[PDB]
Design an enzyme around this catalytic site. Structure first.
Site, mmCIF file in Angstrom:
data_model
loop_
_atom_site.group_PDB
_atom_site.id
_atom_site.type_symbol
_atom_site.label_atom_id
_atom_site.label_comp_id
_atom_site.label_asym_id
_atom_site.label_seq_id
_atom_site.Cartn_x
_atom_site.Cartn_y
_atom_site.Cartn_z
ATOM 1 N N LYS A 33 0.820 -1.205 0.000
ATOM 2 C CA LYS A 33 0.000 0.000 0.000
ATOM 3 C C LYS A 33 0.858 1.262 0.000
ATOM 4 O O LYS A 33 2.043 1.207 0.311
ATOM 5 C CB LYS A 33 -0.935 0.007 1.203
ATOM 6 N N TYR A 34 0.241 2.392 -0.357
ATOM 7 C CA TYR A 34 0.964 3.653 -0.488
ATOM 8 C C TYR A 34 1.424 4.161 0.862
ATOM 9 O O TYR A 34 2.578 4.566 1.022
ATOM 10 C CB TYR A 34 0.074 4.688 -1.165
#
Lengths: 306, 526, 490
Positions: C1-2
């Site tokens: 995920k970012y």
DNA sequence: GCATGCTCTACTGCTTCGATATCG
DNA sequence: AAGCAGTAGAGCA
DNA sequence: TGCTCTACTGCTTCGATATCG
DNA sequence: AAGCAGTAGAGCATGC
């Protein structure tokens, strides 16, 4: 000065707080005007310039909560601080054009903030525009009557009052300099006769015929003084025929009886020689309203007793 | 230094020629003259524009010899450009059409230039003629005026209508003439201006003539005006001692507009009513407003703030030890490729001057770098201020100049690599061959570069390098609009702007059918 | 995920002979491990300053852990790299640190088994975030630590299997008890020497990933495709200089206003207008007027023809070059149209020409889209991703004019000498490692305040020429290339 | 008869932060 | 904000 | 008038400041 | 842009 300086700064405040700052600056103008004989002058510019840059700008399409905030700030400030077309005939036309742009019939939206706020501000403060309220009236009534069928549970009830005060404040002026208007008088009168005879499919042109009939029964009495006497006879027949012949058992139209009573009473105060055969029907009417008290709503229960 | 441009505008009867219904040449010449003078008044250049207006009813001259110098009227001489000339070009709806000749305007312009120049000299002399080539000629003075222009250095540039020999707009990088415009007056005027232009300067006499199609959309008016650059002296080194005295100059770079928006207050029209302040107000509480002398420039580290503002960092910064144009290493393998260049300018490092043994040594260096793909890594600094930088020195072997060009290069903080998914061995998004041929039909109907002219060298449609910049053009026309009519709201954009930035017509018409093909075959788009 | 973060636990084996000098007066492995841990923290406190970094010593005499075991002492907890954590931890350097660790916790005990991995799992489980990387850095030198009891070996490999199940992986950074890698033992049951990554190689980097614009390319008027415009070479620079109060050591929180209209008072956005002067006459306008005079088009890419890759000279560039990729917020199939367009543009060597308007109100700009086919290999040398690439193109006053009227010819007695010279200087380019002197010494100079060791630390710069090693490497042909044909001769 | 009570999802906005134009 | 090398104003002869 | 300290000056480099997706 | 969070408001079941 704290909340007024806090919008004289560089960028901040993501507009659901600038909404509230614009609301507090106006509500403060409403309560306690002892100090702002001076500083409430510039707050007019602080509302108007921002409402201008939010209204007319080809790029940067407009902001939705700050319109609601600035309008409700003006509709709290405009009590006790009027600038009408008697003593300062510039900003009056400016705010009139601005609210007229604010009440145009948008359709493809939900967003009932600027319609509600502009309608309420015009509703409470209709009396300030004394030469620019009398010249757009077919367009005015058409857009207002469009919004009296708006199908919103809080905005139909907020627009009806605007229509009311519009009719109330045009009546006082068409009666004022009679016989040299003589066309606006004739136009509203020939739009009002028979519009209570309308075999209508709603409840609203019905009620607005009632209301304008009972209000414009006034200015026919400086000129004619016999259509006023045909009035109330036409009126009490056209209201007695609505319910006291039929289906007082089965009906749901108990909601227009205050409009009934105010209309019949406001023509009856101007009348002479009440025809002595209809008062036994007026006295079934007002006792029907004295009985019909607990199937009402609060807020309506006070103008009913009025 | 100082520049001088003289604009000849025909007002003659066939210059007052009618319109078929597409565009009109008198309006075209008005647009080009006002483009030039708005550039000159909005760039603040120290120069002079003059007008030579020929074709009006009147005759105004010190000397008007019979039929020559008749229909010669002056309105503004060599002066710095101002709004008076824009008034002269906007209050000229009248032709007042009569013409004696158009070969007298040149000699009277040269005469008034030479009899008016005193004390205020120039470094260029450029005269531009705007005529549609139909009025009469007279070859009374040919060789004496050729030698006078050759001994006074009065260069000249010539402008012609869109007829050289579907719906033609202004010029969309296509065929200039609709069908036909050549007559014998066109012939005789074209050959006399051709022979005076070759006998003045040579081969460019057949090429420094321009139509109103390709003078609006190109900067061919803007030649022999601009000043070159500032001479850069530096010194190149190899190893111990190869100290070549060197000249550097700049090249293509980002263009910025120089004027700024001065914020004034309304209803006064003076500037001095603004005194901005800022207070460095540590409130964090009920408000405490402090004076300056309190401020330590704190940096952030890890999870906190660390002190120590500046004289200590001004001491324990990086010592830059002087400028340098040194050479670090070399590489025979040309492995500096296009997608790593990463600067905002390019630097033409030229040669030496003034006893150019150093320059012939540098030309020997690039004449050694020419034969194979050998690259040169060169370390640059402007001064003590600039951070040092690495860059590549490309060689440049051209016709009248042999130069080297300097581009920058990344340091190893300014990269990042990141995994993206592959599209060849992708089992989901592979296309079909009819889709591929739809793409190929779109390409071969939308292609712009093909070889022709019987020697199969490449000719390109729509060369996206020769366009003038539209941003300062649009901005400057909007300002002249607002300072001309001081209450009117702003226009929409001009149509010759889009007539400049359009793709050509036949390529669109060729692509009309494969664009229908791609729309009809490729699957739905949302 | 970012917004994902990574995690690292330093498990130190300071038990039996690791605390001894190995009877060797050459290097000490405890101080080596603490130097490596200090190097990791002191790099990632400016490289990747949001991960989770914990320090745990085992085999100690006391104990400190929330299940309350014995011999196991956690020291710090999962958090950012901190100046307090490194100024606390560097008290165990050298023999002075050996004695201070002796008196502070002691050394030597019958160390644990599975229970230390249980402590690591209860250290990771508490964190309520999104852990993306779960690694354990083990600093040990023995390689049969329970070579007398097989029940503890079976339970340790069982508990390591249950740590491998949930997604925890360990990489034991081997200390040098035999120096060379001669312990070819049987430690394959637990795992998934070289220390130079932990030592040196990363003193100034960062980590990030965004997309910078998501625009759409329209071909005719109706054929639209969606592309994310990534940026891949970005020019990092030094962080902003925070302002700070002197005494209370806090930010200043400035504020800004405008008044003194020859009356004083205070102003608003509306009372004031924008203006310009041009020689003699003055213009006045509104802020919306000066923001609307640069208004052309809508955000996106507009297809305006095609061209093969032969006219563009690499003399011509203006800015850095971005990279366009087929994203997924128009339709499932814009990838397919981009793949077909990729294949045709590559094989017929044609490149697109477009107009490009970056965001909501910017003037348009001509770009040229050049394709790029990926390159990977056997060992996944993923050096290029497949996709298209912008090149910018100049307009009018970009290209200036030189003096330029100079052309002199030289003599061909120098070309072979220069060919020998450039074959003498020939090195195969680079892949990395040309780091920044200014930013680098700023990093070191900021280390030398909150770590305040002695002075500005090491400041070598790998961008200087070495003339002393250039002269002998070239040789004595400098004089003959200086005066074979041409004397300066003053 | 509409007067009330109750429930799930797309439209609006929030906040960080990286980039970019722009001023000095 | 902070240098920077041609361009001259006038001291010195 | 012939030489030089010096008094600019356009002219560029950089460093900090809102603007915005 | 990258992610979260709220909630306005139109759609499920029973009331003087």
């Amino acid at each position: 000065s704290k909340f007024y300086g806090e919008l004289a700064l560089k960028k901040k405040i993501p507009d659901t707080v600038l909404e509230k700052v614009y609301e507090l600056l106006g509500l403060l103008g409403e309560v306690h005007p002892s100090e702002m004989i001076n500083n409430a002058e510039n707050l007019f510019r602080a509302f108007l310039g921002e409402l201008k840059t939010q209204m007319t700008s080809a790029v940067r399409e407009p902001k939705l909560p700050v319109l609601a905030g600035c309008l409700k700030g003006l509709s709290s400030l405009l009590c006790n601080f009027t600038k009408s077309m008697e003593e300062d005939p510039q900003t009056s036309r400016e705010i009139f054009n601005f609210v007229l742009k604010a009440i145009r019939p948008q359709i493809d939206l939900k967003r009932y903030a600027v319609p509600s706020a502009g309608l309420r501000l015009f509703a409470l403060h209709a009396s300030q525009f004394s030469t620019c309220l009398l010249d757009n009236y077919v367009s005015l009534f058409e857009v207002l009557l469009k919004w009296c069928a708006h199908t919103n549970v809080e905005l139909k009830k907020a627009a009806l009052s605007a229509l009311e005060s519009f009719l109330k404040q045009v009546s006082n002026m068409v009666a004022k300099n009679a016989e040299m208007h003589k066309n606006k008088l004739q136009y509203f009168m020939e739009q009002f006769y028979g519009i209570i005879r309308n075999v209508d499919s709603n409840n609203k042109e019905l009620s607005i015929a009632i209301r304008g009939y009972g209000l414009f029964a006034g200015p026919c009495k400086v000129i004619n003084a016999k259509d006023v006497d045909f009035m109330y006879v036409e009126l009490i027949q056209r209201c007695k025929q609505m319910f006291l012949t039929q289906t007082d058992t089965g009906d749901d139209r108990v909601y227009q009886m205050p409009s009934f009573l105010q209309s019949v009473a406001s023509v009856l105060l101007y009348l002479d020689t009440v025809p002595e055969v209809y008062t036994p029907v007026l006295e079934h009417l007002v006792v029907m309203q004295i009985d019909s008290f607990p199937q009402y709503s609060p807020k309506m229960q006070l103008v009913c007793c009025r | 230094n100082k520049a001088a441009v003289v604009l000849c505008m025909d007002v003659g009867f066939t210059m007052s020629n009618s319109i078929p219904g597409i565009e009109s040449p008198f309006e075209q010449a008005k647009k080009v003259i006002t483009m030039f003078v708005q550039r000159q008044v909005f760039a603040e250049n120290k120069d002079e524009i003059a007008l030579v207006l020929f074709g009006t009813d009147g005759t105004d001259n010190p000397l008007s010899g019979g039929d020559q110098y008749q229909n010669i009227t002056v309105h503004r001489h060599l002066m710095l450009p101002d709004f008076d000339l824009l008034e002269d070009i906007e209050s000229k709806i009248q032709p007042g059409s009569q013409q004696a000749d158009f070969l007298d305007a040149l000699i009277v312009s040269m005469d008034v230039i030479q009899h008016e120049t005193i004390g205020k000299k120039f470094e260029k002399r450029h005269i531009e003629i705007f005529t549609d080539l139909s009025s009469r000629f007279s070859k009374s003075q040919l060789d004496i005026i050729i030698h006078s222009l050759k001994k006074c250095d009065i260069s000249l540039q010539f402008f012609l209508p869109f007829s050289l020999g579907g719906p033609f707009r202004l010029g969309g990088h296509g065929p200039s003439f609709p069908l036909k415009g050549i007559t014998e007056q066109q012939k005789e005027g074209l050959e006399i201006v051709k022979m005076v232009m070759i006998s003045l300067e040579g081969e460019d006499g057949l090429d420094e003539i321009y139509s109103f199609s390709e003078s609006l959309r190109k900067l061919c008016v803007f030649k022999k005006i601009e000043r070159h650059s500032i001479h850069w002296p530096c010194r190149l080194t190899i190893g111990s001692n190869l100290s070549i005295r060197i000249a550097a100059y700049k090249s293509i770079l980002q263009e910025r507009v120089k004027k700024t928006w001065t914020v004034v207050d309304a209803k006064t029209l003076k500037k001095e009513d603004i005194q901005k302040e800022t207070v460095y107000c540590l409130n964090d509480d009920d408000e405490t407003e402090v004076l300056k002398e309190d401020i330590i420039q704190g940096f952030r580290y890890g999870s906190d703030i660390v002190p120590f503002s500046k004289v200590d960092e001004e001491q324990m910064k990086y010592k830059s030890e002087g400028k340098c144009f040194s050479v670090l290493g070399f590489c025979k393998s040309s492995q500096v490729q296009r997608r790593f260049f990463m600067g905002n300018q390019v630097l033409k490092v030229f040669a030496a001057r003034d006893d150019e043994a150093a320059a012939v040594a540098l030309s020997s260096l690039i004449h050694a770098l020419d034969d194979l793909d050998m690259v040169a890594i060169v370390r640059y600094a402007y001064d003590k201020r600039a951070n040092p930088q690495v860059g590549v020195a490309f060689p440049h072997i051209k016709h009248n100049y042999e130069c080297l060009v300097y581009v920058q290069l990344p340091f190893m903080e300014d990269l990042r690599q990141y995994m993206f998914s592959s599209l060849k061995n992708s089992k989901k998004y592979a296309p079909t061959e009819a889709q591929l041929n739809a793409v190929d039909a779109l390409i071969d109907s939308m292609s712009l570069a093909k070889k022709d002219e019987k020697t199969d060298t490449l000719e390109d449609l729509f060369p996206t390098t020769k366009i003038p910049n539209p941003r300062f053009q649009r901005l400057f026309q909007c300002l002249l609009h607002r300072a001309l009519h001081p209450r009117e709201p702003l226009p929409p954009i001009q149509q010759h702007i889009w007539n400049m930035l359009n793709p050509p017509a036949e390529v669109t018409t060729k692509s009309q059918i494969p664009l229908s093909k791609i729309k009809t075959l490729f699957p739905l788009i949302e | 995920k970012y917004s994902g973060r990574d995690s690292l636990i330093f498990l130190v084996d300071a038990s039996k002979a690791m605390f001894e000098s190995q009877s060797e007066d050459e290097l000490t492995p405890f101080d080596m491990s603490i130097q490596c841990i200090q190097s990791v923290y002191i790099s990632k406190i400016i490289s990747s300053d949001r991960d989770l970094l914990a320090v745990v010593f085992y085999g100690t005499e006391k104990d400190k852990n929330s299940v309350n075991f014995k011999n196991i002492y956690v020291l710090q907890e999962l958090d950012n790299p901190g100046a307090k954590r490194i100024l606390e931890l560097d008290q165990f350097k050298g023999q002075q640190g050996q004695k201070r660790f002796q008196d502070m916790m002691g050394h030597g005990s019958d160390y644990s088994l599975s229970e230390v991995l249980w402590v690591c799992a209860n250290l990771f489980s508490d964190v309520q975030f999104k852990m993306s990387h779960k690694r354990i850095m083990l600093f040990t030198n023995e390689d049969n630590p329970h070579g007398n009891d097989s029940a503890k070996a079976s339970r340790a490999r069982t508990k390591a299997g249950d740590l491998r199940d949930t997604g925890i992986f360990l990489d034991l950074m081997h200390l040098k008890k035999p120096g060379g890698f001669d312990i070819s033992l049987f430690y394959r049951d637990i795992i998934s020497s070289k220390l130079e990554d932990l030592l040196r190689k990363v003193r100034a980097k960062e980590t990030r990933k965004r997309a910078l614009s998501r625009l759409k390319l329209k071909l005719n008027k109706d054929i639209v495709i969606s592309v994310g415009i990534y940026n891949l070479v970005q020019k990092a620079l030094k962080p902003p200089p925070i302002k700070l109060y002197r005494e209370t050591n806090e930010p200043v929180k400035t504020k800004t206003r405008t008044f003194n209209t020859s009356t004083g008072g205070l102003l608003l956005p509306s009372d004031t207008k924008r203006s310009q002067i041009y020689g003699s006459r003055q213009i006045i306008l509104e802020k919306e007027e000066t923001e609307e005079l640069k208004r052309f088009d809508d955000p996106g890419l507009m297809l305006m023809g095609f061209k093969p890759l032969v006219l563009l000279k690499k003399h011509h560039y203006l800015r850095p070059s971005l990279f366009v990729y087929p994203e997924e917020s128009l339709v499932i199939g814009s990838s397919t149209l981009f793949s077909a367009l990729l294949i045709k543009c590559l094989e017929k060597e044609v490149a697109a020409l477009c107009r490009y308007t970056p965001r909501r109100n910017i003037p348009p700009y001509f770009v040229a889209l050049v394709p790029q086919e990926e390159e990977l290999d056997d060992q996944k040398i993923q050096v290029t991703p497949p996709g298209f690439q912008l090149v910018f193109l100049p307009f009018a006053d970009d290209k200036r004019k030189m003096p330029f009227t100079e052309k002199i010819m030289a003599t061909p007695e120098q070309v072979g000498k220069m060919k020998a010279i450039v074959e003498k200087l020939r090195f195969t380019y680079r892949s990395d490692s040309f780091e920044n002197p200014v930013l680098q010494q700023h990093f070191r100079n900021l280390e030398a305040l909150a770590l305040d060791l002695m002075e500005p630390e090491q400041a070598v710069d790998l961008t200087l020429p070495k003339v002393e090693a250039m002269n002998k490497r070239l040789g004595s042909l400098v004089d003959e290339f200086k005066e074979l044909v041409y004397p300066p001769d003053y």
